[PDB]
Design a protein around this ligand. Sequence first.
Ligand SMILES: */C(=C\C(=O)Nc1ccc2ncnc(Nc3cccc(Br)c3)c2c1)CN(C)C
Length: 245
Amino acid sequence: AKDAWEIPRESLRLEVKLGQGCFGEVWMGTWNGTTRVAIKTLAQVMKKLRHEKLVQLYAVVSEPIYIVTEYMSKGCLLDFLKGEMGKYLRLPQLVDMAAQIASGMAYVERMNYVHRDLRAANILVGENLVCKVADFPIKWTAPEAALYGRFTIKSDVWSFGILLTELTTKGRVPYPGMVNREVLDQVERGYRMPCPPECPESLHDLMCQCWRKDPEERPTFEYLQAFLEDYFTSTEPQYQPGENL
Ligand SMILES: */C(=C\C(=O)Nc1ccc2ncnc(Nc3cccc(Br)c3)c2c1)CN(C)C
């Protein structure tokens, strides 16, 4: 027995793939004739969480199950960072993107939820470089969580630390040249990725706070949000552009 989020699949006109997908595809489409949407083919969580910086549920169906959402016209952030449009992104654009993800996650945090898979592949980009957390392999995963399954908001904070290296390197894979075993052994031994090229020390220190061994010493998303929003006045007021950041 359905709820009010439910729709008939007859209301959905699928168009383009985006797309597959381990558990299933992602399509661009139309809903009720007027409305451009995205449709994940093969949500309970997505019903209860409503925020500006989180991908917005529109509707759901049932086999074949559809999840219908607000459409993000610029695609996933990984691909945006890797692609044509940025080679020209600089630190102020990338820190503001960071601020927005932090804002969505400060919300997740306030609501006592956990994401579990926070990384640039799971951030979606829309018009005006708006970024939204979507879609609630260990290079992004906090040690206590990759090993003992201890997933909390503080393991999300760690992941956000890694997303920050994706931002500053235009979407390069973390721990370059290291296989998941070598990452896991080295991180346990207290290794952390070094300060990326041109990346200010104050931003890399922030990364290091997110990668504290002890989950409870990692900052909150609320602090992250506030630090990143205020960055260019309070932290780096003498920032000058460089070759890449
Ligand atoms: C980039 C992958 C990608 O996800 N493309 C993509 C573009 C636009 C878009 N808009 C809205 N929603 C999604 N995903 C979605 C649909 C339904 C439920 C959820 Br939760 C999320 C969407 C996806 C390719 N790269 C390899 C990651």
